[PDB]
């Protein structure tokens, strides 16, 4: 049953290769840092150097809770491949109750 | 028995997030035995979550001295490297483990990150 | 135009396999469950059974509102193939007035 | 380090043709209508006409800011293909400072 | 010198809930000087405190060593027996602590519930 | 004088015997964990294994504030003879001002 | 470990007599209308009629949730002794996991 | 039916001796302090110049309202027999519309 | 090696306000090496913002032992003689100050408060 | 341009003596506890022991965040002259980005 | 230790001159409209008859109680030099404990 | 009489000369920018370059209100002297009627 | 008997800032006995408290006829005939309050305030 909560975080982040993408999955997930990793490829259009570029990178999605949100933030600029990356977090409003406490006790 | 208390306390610390104090509690134990694998281990542990790679790294060895079957040493050791920029070091520690632990995927993965970065 | 909503519920979850994916969204679809469904192949890395797995899943999106959502969730637990599914639910601010009355409309 | 922020958005839409995705992805990042887009090829089931359509289509993803997202999303329904265009907007809570900042720097 | 700057760093972490860190800072003090027995005392408070009934137990039984006219460290020697399950240890504990106080309700309170379990 | 308060809590719980209902009233107060304790032999009517049961029981009431609820609770959980123990926190809305004074200095 | 409630009630009314105070506690434990009853023997003075009395009554607790105490409130008002009978609702801010579980599983 | 109230008060306290404790229930009654009050042999253990104390005393309630709590208390402090009286207040946050009544009608 | 490693920690936990589990850390590394100066005065440093200002001036006077050439802790000591109403001391260690640091206006006005506070 | 701020602090208190004044403004700044401190001479009159005094004393304004206020307000107590000194906090609504930037930056 | 307060107020008001603004400072203290008053010599630059005026005048400053404010503001009307003069409320939002205690006792 | 007001505020800035503090008091009232200012000579000190230094600085208060806050804001950065000027924003929260209609025309 | 109750009746009042109340009080005090020169004083602070200068000023005289070394009520005396603009019987009324009490600041002040105010 749907059950309201607020402590549970998705950070969403774009690295440029598939191998980095995966290695930062596995890595952020064995070290209880994210309880789950989803890798999308996608094509990213932006202005880098005042040019457009359009490039095949490949979006991260870490679910987390409120708790090891910052401690997941923390470790992935340590380690990401770009000098300024994408750090966005959105805040699931429900879910249900069993995968709720699955995802808390896999942090 | 004064170092098994010290090294319960930093491992307790550990799991709280508190790394600082868990830093101080594995110092601690490690006056008493300086020879404890696990107290070296667990100390690199603390230091590479907190970010400090180079004592991450000095810790890990000291670990594999007194211990060189620890495949989460290991591989532990080559991710502090691959933190540094030092991909030769990452892939012949990464190697390492994957000989202790073959189906390890996170060492596996590793390795094919650092093969791929010095190859760049 | 932009008109803030609250009315208006994004079902997220994760099927092992396309066949199942279109299903599943088929499904939902034709009985008035949800308006839309997006069916989007990611990887996933998760801990199974205190192991590490990476594999290859399909993620379901499903369109709906805060009336039809516990509908849609029940019937989904009821069918999905996973013995603990993913259930998220996000929340958009704000939609066109075409699209939400569209959105309403096909429930 | 992560920061509380309201003055980001995230508009979610769909295009049928890749080329059209380019394009649109290309033209809003251009004028300063978004940041950054990123396009991904998803399968899309609805009701049109009243008959099940299972199609693929492309989606879109534009960062912006609220001060910036009427106005982009005013250019979009101008130029959609579809007469009835998808317009979600979701709100991240959160960013990294640098992020944010180069977020706004660039609308 | 050093030794009792650390024991009182201990009891002002004691006092303000940080039992952990008091562990850390009364262990300190205890290389210092092994033979202190406010400090063996005070870290088996800490420990009891915290829950850990068995190195609270330790703690209490070497302060005891260097001063067994301690009435609170019989009694709370006894109260970790009793949390234990332990009711023979903890009617023994329990009758020196009132040995040493008579007019000790909490001890003596104890006492009647340690010998009550016992007899189910 | 009456003053508002929200740092004062009432834990109410019950145990079978007065030798242990005493027991923990001495010793929670004695080491600052509740500033008093009232003791009330009740008669407790609940569902023991699916069967109605009736039975003599003793009332216990810790009178603590919000910062020492907690440590109360810890201690009492890992003290109380009963498998699963009642935990009911109650909070007065206003007291005397000597009479909060009182019991903040006490713990 | 204490979690802050709002969805527990505790219904504070007092009977003349011991046998009826036994009564209504096991009718109302067995019929899942109150998870727990206790009965207290109080003395009570309140003016009948015009005229002080001082009588010997027991007070009766039932602890129900939110959701359980209309249909309670209703059984005891067709059924309380009293015409005119006592009805006092408090509410715990706080209760332990396993109590709370306990608590709403039984009605 | 019940109906959410915040006008109705429980004031708690404690006197060493019963012929105190029926005195102080009859006397604020007689006068419109108290609607009720209730008289409970309890067992309170604190701390009294730094030694534990374990005495029988005798626990009153009062049931007032809002506007004449103010009016109660003051009296009870002038007379109670301890010099640092307890004073607590609970609020119900419902009750019986008769009760109510009832209760407001006898201040 | 590890006398460092606690110097360093103390260090990060003094810059965050953890004066107590600075003064553990800084306690730790005068263990291995008690001739550590700056040791010594960051001790004081984190004594002193605590507000004990007796165990504040037995660090500094430790620390000026070792390095009499400090400035700084010359002009703490006489911040924590100051505390104390020990105007006499104040004023020597203020003007030990100002003669290795003649352009130190806090050690200045220091000076001057403790003068004026002595002729009162 | 202006933002508005909660994190900015204005403590303001009064030394007897100037000499006193300099040397608390200058060690409260050197040591991070304060940003900026403005000494100000002013006439003071108040009612020291039951009668009225006029005296010339310097008013001093510390600028400050509120994570750094605490540890001011100990710091100056332990080492204000006056055995009960004036302690009031006013907080700025708004200030420009670069001044609060170098406040913060400056503790 | 400080508490956040909300019953203390500054009122700041200028006059002509030291001799008035000595006589408004001792009166407003002696008679409990005001705890303390601070007179600094300042400046003003404002429009008098529609042509600018540089003046030299003295600034009050009354630390009172959110009680006692009314009635000092009406008595300083009636007694301000003035015709219009300047009345500015200030709220101090904490203070030490021992300062707030002498502030409130002084009127 | 005291009327709750949010519409006035007091800009503080600090200026190294008494020449430029009233010349900076005397344009900005002229144009409506405020309605009066006035100018006290404080000591400052803060770090700058990295020491200490104690200066003879003017304090400057704008009373204005929140519409034309803004205005005299942008000027003020655009004149004053200083690279980086301090801007600390006040809000009154009450004034009497006539003094805040005086101020409200005079800009 | 029933005059000293409503004297202290008023002076409740007026404590609370109920200064209508209070002179309601006072007023029905002085029937009972018109020579009491503290409930003459008393109402005319009442009334100055009010803002009514001219009842204030007539109570005060009457006060001063009963007890005309009342240092107080020849202070507050020139304090109402100051809130009237008349100076020349602030200045005789201040200086009468300065002979009674010469160490008076407020009186003082006001001395020189109605003298300069006079002069202007």
Redesign the interface.
């Given at each position: 049953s749907l059950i309201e909560t607020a402590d549970l975080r998705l950070l969403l982040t774009t690295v440029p290769t598939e191998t980095e993408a995966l290695y930062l999955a596995l890595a952020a997930v064995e070290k209880g840092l994210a309880a789950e990793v989803l890798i999308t490829p996608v094509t990213r259009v932006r202005r880098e150097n005042g040019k457009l570029v359009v490039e095949d990178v490949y979006r991260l999605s870490f679910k987390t809770t409120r708790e090891r949100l910052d401690a997941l933030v923390a470790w992935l600029q340590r380690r990401h491949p770009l000098a300024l990356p994408e750090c966005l977090v959105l805040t699931p409003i429900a879910s249900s109750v069993a995968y709720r406490d699955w995802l808390r006790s896999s942090l | 028995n004064?170092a098994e208390?010290?090294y319960k306390?930093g491992q307790?610390?550990f799991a709280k997030?508190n790394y600082?104090?868990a830093?101080?509690?594995y110092?601690?134990a490690?006056?008493k035995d300086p020879n404890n694998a696990e107290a070296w281990y667990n100390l690199g542990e603390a230091y590479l979550?907190l970010?400090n790679y180079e004592?991450a790294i000095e810790a890990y060895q000291k670990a594999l001295e007194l211990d060189p079957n620890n495949a989460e040493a290991w591989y532990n050791l080559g991710?502090a490297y691959?933190?540094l920029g030092d991909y030769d070091n990452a892939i012949e520690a990464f190697t390492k483990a994957l000989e202790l632990d073959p189906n390890n995927?996170?060492a596996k993965?590793?390795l094919?990150?650092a093969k791929?970065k010095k190859a760049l």
């Open positions: - | 004064l208390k010290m306390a307790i610390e997030g600082e104090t830093i101080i509690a110092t601690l490690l006056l979550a970010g004592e991710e691959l933190a995927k996170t993965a590793g094919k990150l791929e």
